[PDB]
Symmetry: C3
Subunit: 479 residues, 3 copies
């Protein structure tokens, strides 16, 4: 009789978008992973000191508040608010100091110390009885006042340094310590990778009057000392300089850049593990992209996007009289039949696995291209702490918006390439049958052949393995 | 004889650009609307006070200059230049104050007042005889000088606040009012969503000497008072603070953000109406995009672009021996003929209307995509006043340049999709005829069939409605 | 017998990337030019004063250091480091001054002078014996001190102006010159296209103490004068103002913007010429794009990119029983044969030259589009000096990264268009032969015809120039 080849009919599932049209497919999936409803923290440590410490207390090494000086640092931390009192002095901070101290207290790297150099250069530090419980500071009080100097040093890592002043609100103490006159203004300047400065004057003058009013009082109500801070930045291989006068203060530590821990905001669950966490949940194992609105994460995580897209997973449906589909039931994507159901239908295997492999190859290439584009956009030598510190109070990142469009543009090309490859694979099989049958059989030109003799089920399945021969089927003639 | 189907030949009009080639089409149009030569302002109000007021006079509520305190505000306004004198004090402004006052005097929203809170907190305001014609200011003069304080308040909308000082150039008055010494420097600071400050000193010192020289004199030549201003920004839900000392001044009003009117620059015409206006003309009704170089407009207007593009409006011309065109005259885009003119040609209707609808569908989808991209680029909660205030003196916007390329990229995809859809529509009609005629008629494979018998005009037009039958045409045989 | 037409088989060279697939081609090239290992400077002048001058000495017109006051300026220059001493005063610079003097000393344009206006407005300049070897400065010392003034002037070009102070470290000299008190602070302000200021006080006070310590000493060890500088910017058509008090100093010259020379970093070679040079080498003649990481160059150079790409140069290979290739040896890209080698094969010429011209046309259009995009990105009225001055210490430019992706996107479209045009050219030739042979010869449908009679070598080459006739080949019949 006659034989035909083609695909197997399956119900339609969805539609995808290509360059020139919309296609109907029997299966599709997504590229991104979705957030969970909890945090999986099996085999981890959690640090919590929300009842005793504050943000400032950690920097100054108060008694019992020493997160940044530990050998092993947990990846989850929580502490009190920024306006929490201490047990030593009263303190005042500027806006930049607040912005950088929101981050610098929980870095996961190593910190550098240079107090001994100052001690050996200028002698012993000043002493007071109101700071018995604090350790990390250096007070410059020379014998001859004011005696300005300039201190220069070569840095070791990239990070931030805090500097400022420490003064009392009594006029007699101010005159005895500074050695200046009340009706004067004097500055402290920091020059590094950038430039910064701060100004001071007498107690009953500007701008010290505002500092006294805006300060945060301490637990002990008999403390008369206020310390005012500000920040500056350094670089690894260069030299930084500070101008010093009698009365200035500096914290002798460099907080090197790196990664910082996250603060949980949802319920914490044990007895389950993962490898990528955020402040609002975890993510599934082995993902290629993450649906997130920032770049702050702990663990090993892929890049981030703002929304999700669809990618083909099956094959296109092109059918409704032969049209290209086979009504039989077969365990494959391609088949050969002779208008018989149950025994007159057979399936091949090579085309199925080739079509399977094409998708994986194309998807891997697209993922690699996306990774390279991300690296170009953000740079090879990047640090999360610096990236989030530079943003400040802004919650919108333009680079994420720029990156999101690239994936949307790439998905269409991926779909088009996959479909064209499937068509190319399908085209070749039709040629291997025409040359195999010979030139004595006519072809309908629509994938269905029509043979000179009768072709039974064995005739059909012998073609599938390709061991077909013409010698034993010559008998009888029919059209 | 034989019959053929195809399109109708029409003269060529232009060319369009697709992904892979340039196409020749019989009709095209544009996406953007062009500016007019005048302003259509029928049924509108125009405000003009160019002969009496100035920009500063409006903020201080001078006698007869009260634009920002009206229930109904017109959409067109004009006033005098910025260096126009007043009838009260002498005044001095900084650069930021000038930049923001170029806009804040003509907002179309609501303004908030908080003078009563200050009055009930610190008592009555200071009094002088040189400001009898002004109302909108508060002067802080306590009994004990200087007496610094800090004032904190929770805001209601998002906007700008002006603050500064008011002093005389006589030494005795300065000492009597401020209560300080001449050889001193004192500051006023504003902290909100950002930070700002300003400094003052005695009359025969810096920087007051420059303030005296650079000031703008008043109409009355016996005024000895200069008021110096500066600006700051607030946010809706947060708290803002001001540092006050004896002698400072603040204008107790918040100018909320929103839209502001335009100043006509061309001839104004009545007796004609529109719904979108700019400073250089109006735009036609019902446009989808606007050819304009800014985002400042009044009314209901679509997004803006920097140049214009072309979009297909007819069908592609593919012809020069049959080639695919019909030389007859028909009232449609598709037809059937038998090499006869006048009576041997007929036209169908379904294909024409389907091809008509495809263009509308594709164009609507493209427009929606463009709107979504614009919203992503600029943000959902946006205000024109803030957007133009942040730019400053720059006249080039990069976001418009980024947005312009997106439309150019989208137009090519639109054209490609439309052409492919037209080809898909055309392909199906050829199949419905082969199955209708039957298997006893050969096909030339180029859209022309060739029938076994003679096929007259009734034979031709019966096919058009699809009521063709084979029983009554069997007689005679010819090839 | 039978005849066939097609291409000529050549070995495969490489692969290129298109919209929907990867193609195999017999030839390809690149779009960008690569750097050399030296500098070609035949017929050029080189300036070198690394042994006597410094950067600061050039601005002040020291004896023998006068680069910015020459009629003809060489395109290569080199001088000493920034901290080189002079023979006059001691000097101090800020960060912005350093950043701008890294560039302004080697501009190739014209500079403007306005000293005579100052002389005629305020009289003769101050005189000192420590600056006998310097000429380019103006010192304001009026008879009555301090006597502040404001100086306003309309500019001529766009550029930078340096201003500041000149003072001694002795208390008596300070009091005698300035006419102020030691416990005071006074400022100098510059308002133009932007705003800037600087502050000064007494010798044993802040911030003069830091200035004295950080200064650079002069060759003569008996000089007691320090000059402190800062910078400001102007615009062509506007007015700029300066606040002056007794003791200020200004350099009366405007350094107009333009191009500046390069400093060689590699070996310099004569006896060879080019037309585009950089600091690390030269580039080949007649290039369309340059592989560079900046926009600083001298000569006539095209735009710059960060990496290189591939562009097709031959024709696609589509073959492995005829498949479309001819095994004969021909001097062309297309040919006709009759399964005979040596004398039964001929080549045409028109198709070859048409295919050659298509590539040139498409490439030229792409290059023009790229040029227009570059002009849109950077602006029509641009200056290298201003562009690099605004960047500062940053070594990464985002606009180059944005521009690099455009070329990568354009190359794919170029390849697709070229391939489609080649297919369109190839398709038409097959039609001109079917109509020429007539309707009495069958066609195999794969580019090979099959004729009713025998067709020899003269028969083959008769088709080549198209003068074939059917009358003399009618004899005999065969299939
Ligand atoms: C010290 O530094 C810390 C680190 O920077 C500071 O932490 C930030 O604090 C902010 C104040 O609380 C906080 O902002 C909040 O964010 C919350 C986010 O949770 C929401 O959950 C919703 C579902 O329940 C989401 O719908 C919502 O938005 C979505 O986010 C998706 C990503 O998961 C997007 O794909 C979606 O499009 C969707 O919309 C986005 O919203 C973003 C804003 O959240 C927006 O930027 C983006 O463009 C999309 O439009 C969101 O996920 C909100 O519920 C709160 O209302 C509030 O906005 C920051 O997130 C904190 N930063 C980080 C990195 O977590 C800390 O404040 C600082 N300390 C001090 C004292 O300043
Ligand atoms: C208070 O705030 C106000 C609001 O910001 C300030 O108003 C601005 O004042 C500026 C100074 O006058 C003014 O700049 C002028 O703009 C005019 C524009 O008119 C021109 O008309 C020509 C035809 O006759 C056009 O060819 C020309 O440019 C075109 O614009 C098309 C859009 O319509 C573009 O599609 C074209 O490409 C073309 O070229 C553009 O030109 C733009 C500059 O105009 C350029 O930015 C863009 O990239 C294209 O290259 C233009 O339309 C000019 O004639 C004047 O020469 C001058 O440039 C601003 O437009 C005002 N702002 C607004 C929003 O109108 C006000 O100054 C301020 N007060 C104070 C004291 O500062
Ligand atoms: C006054 O102004 C001057 C002008 O701005 C200042 O000159 C700058 O001085 C810098 C300090 O020396 C200098 O930075 C150096 O650049 C060198 C570049 O030479 C390298 O050669 C290598 C081959 O041997 C390349 O591999 C290397 O990088 C490549 O560059 C290619 C372009 O040729 C790119 O296509 C490649 O991708 C590749 O990688 C790039 O590197 C770039 C950094 O160089 C990077 O920005 C880019 O994104 C790519 O990643 C490079 O070509 C280095 O060897 C040195 O290590 C150092 O980085 C600047 O180049 C100078 N500026 C100019 C315009 O030349 C001068 O400092 C200033 N005076 C003062 C006192 O400040
Ligand atoms: C997701 O990946 C994590 C990898 O950290 C898996 O956690 C490990 O699972 C293996 C397999 O049982 C255990 O031997 C390890 O002890 C686990 N790690 C830890 C730290 O306990 C986790 O099982 C994976 N989850 C899923 C669903 O596959
Ligand atoms: C453009 O649209 C405006 C919409 O404001 C039209 O103005 C209105 O036109 C209708 C129809 O005559 C009138 O009844 C209204 O009174 C008009 N509005 C006002 C405020 O007077 C305008 O006619 C339209 N123009 C064109 C050419 O269509
Ligand atoms: C590259 O172009 C330069 C153009 O400046 C060529 O230099 C000129 O070459 C011509 C031809 O011999 C000479 O007559 C000129 O005198 C050269 N210019 C100078 C300034 O000497 C150079 O020869 C070209 N190089 C190549 C390899 O083509
Ligand atoms: C194909 O074969 C079937 C049965 O053998 C026959 O009915 C049909 O006419 C054949 N078709 C052609 C085109 O020969
Ligand atoms: C498509 O397949 C998925 C996977 O099984 C299934 O969840 C979904 O319901 C299917 N779509 C439809 C419309 O049935
Ligand atoms: C400290 O800050 C928290 C943050 O909301 C606030 O509730 C609390 O009132 C503040 N403490 C004081 C003393 O103002
Ligand atoms: C303070 O001023 C007085 C008088 O002006 C002066 O005698 C004294 O030396 C000054 N003190 C300092 C530390 O400068
Ligand atoms: C088509 O019909 C016409 C007239 O009936 C005839 O001249 C021509 O040869 C026919 N073509 C074919 C291919 O049969
Ligand atoms: C194309 O059609 C428009 C609309 O009628 C017409 O204005 C234009 O002249 C036409 N183009 C040509 C080349 O005739
Ligand atoms: C005020 O500004 C205008 C703007 O051009 C100017 O013409 C006028 O001279 C200025 N008035 C004074 C007094 O300078
Ligand atoms: C001004 O200075 C003098 C002397 O230095 C002092 O007696 C007087 O109290 C000062 N006045 C004020 C308001 O500080
Ligand atoms: C083509 O011609 C050759 C020789 O003339 C012959 O062997 C072959 O069968 C012909 N092919 C067809 C389809 O007629
Ligand atoms: C491709 O052609 C170029 C030009 O001659 C040659 O240098 C290169 O080796 C060729 N490629 C291969 C793989 O032979
Ligand atoms: C001047 O700068 C160079 C730059 O490296 C440095 O080597 C030299 O030591 C500096 N001179 C002085 C006196 O510091
Ligand atoms: C400096 O101060 C003294 C006392 O305060 C005063 O007598 C003298 O006039 C002042 N000198 C100047 C130049 O202001």
């Amino acid at each position: 009789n006659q034989i035909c080849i083609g695909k197997a009919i399956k119900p339609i599932n969805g539609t995808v978008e290509t360059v020139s049209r919309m296609a109907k497919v029997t299966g599709m999936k997504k590229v991104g992973g979705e957030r969970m409803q909890k945090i999986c923290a099996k085999g981890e440590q959690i640090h919590d000191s929300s009842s005793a410490c504050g943000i400032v207390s950690h920097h100054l090494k108060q008694e019992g508040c020493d997160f940044p000086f530990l050998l092993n640092k947990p990846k989850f931390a929580t502490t009190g608010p920024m306006n929490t009192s201490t047990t030593g002095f009263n303190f005042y901070l500027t806006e930049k100091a607040k912005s950088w101290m929101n981050i610098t207290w929980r870095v996961l790297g190593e910190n550098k110390d240079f107090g001994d150099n100052l001690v050996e250069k200028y002698g012993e530090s000043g002493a007071t009885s109101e700071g018995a419980t604090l350790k990390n500071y250096y007070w410059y009080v020379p014998t001859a006042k004011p005696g300005p100097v300039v201190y220069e040093k070569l840095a070791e890592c990239t990070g931030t340094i805090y500097y400022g002043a420490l003064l009392s609100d009594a006029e007699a103490g101010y005159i005895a310590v500074t050695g200046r006159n009340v009706t004067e203004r004097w500055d402290v300047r920091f020059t590094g990778s950038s430039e910064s400065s701060i100004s001071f004057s007498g107690p009953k003058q500007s701008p010290m009057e505002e500092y006294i009013i805006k300060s945060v009082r301490s637990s002990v109500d008999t403390v008369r000392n206020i310390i005012i801070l500000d920040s500056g930045r350094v670089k690894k291989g260069e030299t930084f300089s500070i101008s010093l006068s009698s009365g200035a203060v500096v914290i002798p530590t460099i907080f090197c850049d790196g990664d910082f821990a996250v603060t949980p905001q949802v319920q914490i669950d044990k007895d389950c593990a993962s490898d990528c966490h955020s402040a609002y949940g975890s993510f599934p194992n082995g993902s290629s992209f993450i649906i997130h609105h920032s770049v702050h994460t702990v663990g090993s995580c892929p890049p981030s996007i703002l929304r999700n897209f669809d990618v083909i997973d099956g094959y296109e449906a092109t059918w409704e009289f032969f049209t290209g589909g086979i009504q039989g039931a077969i365990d494959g994507w391609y088949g050969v039949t002779n208008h018989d159901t149950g025994k007159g239908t057979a399936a091949d295997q090579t085309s199925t696995q080739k079509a399977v492999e094409a998708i994986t190859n194309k998807l891997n290439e697209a993922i690699e291209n996306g990774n390279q584009r991300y690296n170009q956009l953000y740079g090879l030598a990047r640090t999360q702490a610096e990236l989030l510190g530079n943003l400040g109070k802004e919650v919108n990142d333009l680079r994420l918006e720029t990156f999101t469009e690239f994936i949307r543009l790439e998905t269409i090309l991926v779909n088009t390439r996959i479909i064209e490859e499937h068509q190319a694979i399908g085209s070749k099989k039709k040629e291997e049958v025409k040359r195999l049958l010979g030139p004595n059989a006519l072809d309908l030109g629509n994938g269905c052949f029509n043979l000179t003799h009768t072709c039974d089920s064995n005739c059909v399945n012998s073609i599938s393995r390709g061991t077909y021969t013409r010698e034993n089927y010559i008998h009888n003639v029919t059209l």
